[PDB]
Design a binder for this molecule. Structure first.
Ligand code: ZN
Lengths: 60, 206, 261, 98
RNA sequence: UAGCGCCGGCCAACUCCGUGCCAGCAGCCGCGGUAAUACGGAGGGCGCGAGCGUUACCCGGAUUCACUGGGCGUAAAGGG
RNA sequence: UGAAACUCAAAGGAAUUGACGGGGGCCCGCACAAGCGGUGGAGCAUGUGGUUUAAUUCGAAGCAACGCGAAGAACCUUACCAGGCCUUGACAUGCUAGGGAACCCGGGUGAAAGCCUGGGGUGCCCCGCGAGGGGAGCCCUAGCACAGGUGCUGCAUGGCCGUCGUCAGCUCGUGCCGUGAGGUGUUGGGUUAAGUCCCGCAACGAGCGCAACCCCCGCCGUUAGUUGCCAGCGGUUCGGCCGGGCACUCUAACGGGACUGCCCGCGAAAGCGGGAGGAAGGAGGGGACGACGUCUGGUCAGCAUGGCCCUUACGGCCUGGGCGACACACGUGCUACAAUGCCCACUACAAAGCGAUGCCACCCGGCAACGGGGAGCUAAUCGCAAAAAGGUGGGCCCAGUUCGGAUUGGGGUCUGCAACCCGACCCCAUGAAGCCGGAAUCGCUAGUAAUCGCGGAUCAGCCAUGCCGCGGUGAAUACG
């Protein structure tokens, strides 16, 4: 999650299968969700904050 | 321990989402990124005026930003100059003819974020933590607010070992859904590190 | 903190949304907070670095209060009134003052010819008596003459020692000084007017002649002129010195200097 | 407006409060005197009355302490008949003398 | 001609520099290992003043030999 | 009978709060017991300890680390190693010493990064006369600030998480008791999942807790009938396929309903054992929910941040390797050791999900994975999608076997710029140990265990037997 790596993951890397996703909030490259583009930790924080529309605590 | 977010616990009922809009899977993440950028900019700029809440809604390629501020004059500025330049900045950020709105929070002692940021500001000014917390809880308790609670994290008064302070008064039932508990977080950056301030306020029931 | 008594002082000042208020040495901001809720604009002069964070924090919920970090003496008050009070009719000064800077801080404001309406302050009871003194009450002196020549004075009440949590050594009193419409008495020779006023009370228990001739080398040379002018102005250096009214001093400051000016 | 269950809880609370605090509801302020059937069974009550300089009237019996009671009626505390007689006479006197 | 003691609590009189369990202070409780009102020096203050402190000794505080004026079940104290 | 010299600033008595006992008593919980399945034996998958290594990047360490961070290591990820290169640098705001402000094409060098570079520049931007000229348009290399760091301390911290523990406790106001610390409330009997209630009692209440409010499932109503449903009606080419209707199922909003509510008996009371009614009866089943605090618990490698350190390298880019090694040991799993079984055909019955670079119906070719055509679908419309165990028919006959399914040889497909290190899925060859596993040990009380399939996140593809959900068939025992 170095600044350099963050910036490097935003250029067309000469090949199709080199580009990978990073957390748009913290540059995490481990557990990003494609639907949101946020890592699990950032997802949880924003979900709790109520800043994610339509997302709530699941219970069944 | 490990209490969960008192707002996230009540997103369905007694509270509401800060962002209210719809987007399909194709164009969800982009709107969220724009939204986060807007929030960042607003927090950065309007901090002086005492921001407490930012609401974003979308109808059709439009943005209706509502800012809840203790002091609306600062935001508006003289002859509506500052509000206009802020609108210009936001519109330049994203070409979506944004429609900024300003509301004044009634009785600014009854908003938990305001209380939290005030306590953090006090801590930054090398105040006495315990006394400040007691006074803050007292002021919240004065103007209704059936329950009040303030927590300051640790590293008190440039000490070596961290410790929690916690002054509270009244009913703060974190276990009840129909509580209408207003919550606020703040971060106080001092020369000996960072401190966390949390404020809970309890405004009746149902 | 002195509770509702603060709200009392402002009550004796009668400020509203019409008025702008100048605060001198606010301190914590006990009086400033009370003034803020009742005044359209509040301005403050604070020069102590240690009390600044506390004062700022106390003023956090408010917006119509401005604090300028500069000593009153050095700063031009006229300009501050010009900007800060562009949109208010009545301009008033409410303050509580440190013991050393009590009179000179008043004198600076009075000398500057500010558009101030009234100065309602808390001072020493002794100083309050001296400022507002009837003739031959042993309180009559340079202070009384000067103030009443500039501004009409009125002591409201006496604040007892048994108010402040740290009990002081001397009691306090609240006074009002309303700026008169123009000089009280017509005399062009303001400087020598004040010279005469201060010289006449050089020795309180002495006579006018003693307090006149002893002062000033020319005066100590030309004795007879003083006497003949005094008799010209229908005054004599025998009565006491402390029994004279302001207009009498006006007549003397006209005549005596008219002899040599 | 409430979950029935909540109404049931409130009703139980009301029932308990009604059971214990009935009659006592008429005291808007501290009483003027006090009337005790048995001063020994009612040691706490007598002591509380003493502490607040309130006159004490008792229907004391053999196993009682006559010193703690100002106005004492030496009689039976059992024997339902005696309770009825004394209380009836007292209440009649109160009602008549109003 | 104006000195002498003191300024942590007893006990009236507070800050800045030097040292860092060292040098030292000390009537008792105790202060001294880097933010010392307790050590050393300054500024300031307090008490007395041709004097002010220290040591020694006696009475007091000591109802701590109790006649005024104490106690003995478990605190020292009922005899095998 | 009975000293003193010397030392110390205490030595003591009663009682209070807590800690601890290997002091005792009471209660609870798959803790033991009664059962059903496993683990430890074997093969393989994966994570650790060790060892080799150029590096085998790090953090995690009893329960509460060990299918953990990692919901996706062939390059990228990547933080480690070996080489090949750059120094205001990928990225930020500036400062101002000549381009001159600007974009595009192209060659040598070549493992690539980078380096050296030549030609059309894109020039105007106002328009001083204008014939170069003032710059807000834009970019190269030269000036200083500075970028930066997965470099180090979780024993400087914030945030968030784990655990005791969803255990039932942790406190306060006023009153009363005690000279005082303090106590009572909160202790005693009974009962409960529970300081949950009841009685007694100098307490009477409240706050954080338990409970309830919230969600799903179980029943019945109004609202509404498409892309869903089909009792009668008319159609039928046999398909709710058609006209038709929203009765029924269903879909999703608002409601009702269960509260010891009503009768019998016991009990002082809370309640207790039965009985109606009811879809459901004593908390109906499940979830979300985690008090004061404990563990110097965990994370400076998600992020923020105090402090220390490097700034021609501990920063930055690229190529190749490693994280996948291997005499061994430990953990969590998967597949079996067979006849209540194995293989082969025919035939059924679900729920919850996902999809416009995608899902792929249908056709053809290939034995096969797949390839080529190709509709339909932003989807209660189309598709993935055959559900599997099951039921019927046939074979197999106790044999390391038509049980197993490792390892090896060859051929073929797709993803990808590239499958050697190290991808998956195929087709033909061989057929490994393994005949129910010692001491010990783990889970589970009901739609549960056991067993059987399906979907999803991550993701070009996948080393997933993992994780999070969905349903199908459905035991036993709980004396204590
Ligand atoms: Zn993130």
């Amino acid at each position: 999650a170095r600044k350099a790596l963050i910036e490097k993951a935003k250029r067309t890397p000469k090949f199709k299968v080199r580009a990978y996703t990073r957390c748009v909030r913290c540059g995490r490259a481990r557990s990003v969700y494609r639907f949101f583009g946020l890592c699990r930790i950032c997802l949880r924080e924003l979900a709790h904050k109520g800043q994610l529309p339509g997302v709530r605590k699941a219970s069944w | 321990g490990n209490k969960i977010h008192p707002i996230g616990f009540r997103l369905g009922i007694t509270r509401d989402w800060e962002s209210r809009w719809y987007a399909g899977k194709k164009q969800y993440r982009h709107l969220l990124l724009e939204d986060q950028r807007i929030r960042g900019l607003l927090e950065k700029e309007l901090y002086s005026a005492g921001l407490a809440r930012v609401d974003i809604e979308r109808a059709a390629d439009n943005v209706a930003v509502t800012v809840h501020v203790a002091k609306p004059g600062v935001v508006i500025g003289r002859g509506g100059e500052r509000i206009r330049v802020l609108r210009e900045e936001l519109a330049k950020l994203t070409g979506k003819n944004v429609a900024l709105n300003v509301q004044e929070v009634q009785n600014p002692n009854l908003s938990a974020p305001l209380v939290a940021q005030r306590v953090a500001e006090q801590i930054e000014r090398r105040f006495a933590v315990r006394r400040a917390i007691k006074q803050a809880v007292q002021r919240v308790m004065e103007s209704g607010a059936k329950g009040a609670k303030v927590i300051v994290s640790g590293r008190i008064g440039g000490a070596e070992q961290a410790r929690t302070e916690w002054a509270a008064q009244g009913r703060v039932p974190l276990h009840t859904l129909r509580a209408n508990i207003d919550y606020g977080f703040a971060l106080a950056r001092t020369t000996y590190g960072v401190l966390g301030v949390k404020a809970y306020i309890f405004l009746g029931e149902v | 903190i002195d509770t509702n008594i603060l709200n009392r002082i402002v009550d004796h000042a009668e400020v509203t949304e019409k008025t702008g208020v100048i605060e001198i040495g606010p301190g914590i901001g006990a009086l400033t907070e009370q003034l803020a809720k009742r005044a359209k604009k509040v301005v403050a002069f604070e020069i102590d670095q240690r009390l600044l964070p506390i004062l700022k924090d106390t003023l956090s919920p408010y917006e119509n209060v401005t604090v300028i970090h500069q000593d009153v003496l050095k700063a031009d008050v006229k300009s501050v009134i010009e900007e800060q009070f562009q949109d208010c009719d009545e301009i008033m000064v409410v303050a509580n003052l440190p013991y050393y800077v009590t009179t000179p801080i008043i004198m600076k404001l009075l000398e500057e010819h500010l558009p101030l309406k009234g100065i309602v302050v808390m001072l020493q009871k002794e100083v309050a008596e001296r400022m507002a003194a009837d003739p031959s009450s042993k309180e009559y002196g340079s202070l009384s003459i000067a103030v009443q020549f500039y501004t009409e004075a009125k002591t409201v009440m006496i604040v007892p020692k048994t108010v402040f949590v740290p009990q002081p050594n001397v009691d306090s009193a609240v006074i009002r000084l309303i700026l008169r419409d123009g000089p009280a008495v017509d005399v062009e020779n303001e400087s020598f007017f004040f010279q005469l006023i201060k010289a006449s009370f050089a020795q309180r228990r002495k006579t006018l002649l003693n307090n006149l001739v002893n002062n000033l080398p020319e005066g100590k040379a030309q004795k007879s002129t003083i006497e003949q002018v005094l008799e010209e102005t229908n005054i004599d250096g025998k009565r006491r010195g402390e029994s004279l009214s302001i207009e009498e001093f006006a007549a003397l400051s006209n005549g005596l200097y008219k002899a040599l000016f | 407006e409430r979950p029935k269950k909540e109404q049931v809880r409130l009703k139980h609370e009301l029932e308990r409060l009604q059971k214990y605090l009935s009659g006592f509801r008429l005291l808007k302020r501290l009483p003027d005197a006090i009337f005790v059937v048995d001063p020994t069974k009612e040691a706490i009550a007598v002591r509380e009355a003493r502490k607040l300089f309130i006159p004490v009237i008792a229907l004391a019996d053999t196993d009682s302490d006559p010193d703690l009671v100002d106005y004492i009626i030496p009689g039976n505390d059992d024997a339902i008949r005696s309770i009825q007689l004394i209380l009836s006479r007292a209440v009649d006197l109160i009602i008549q003398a109003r």
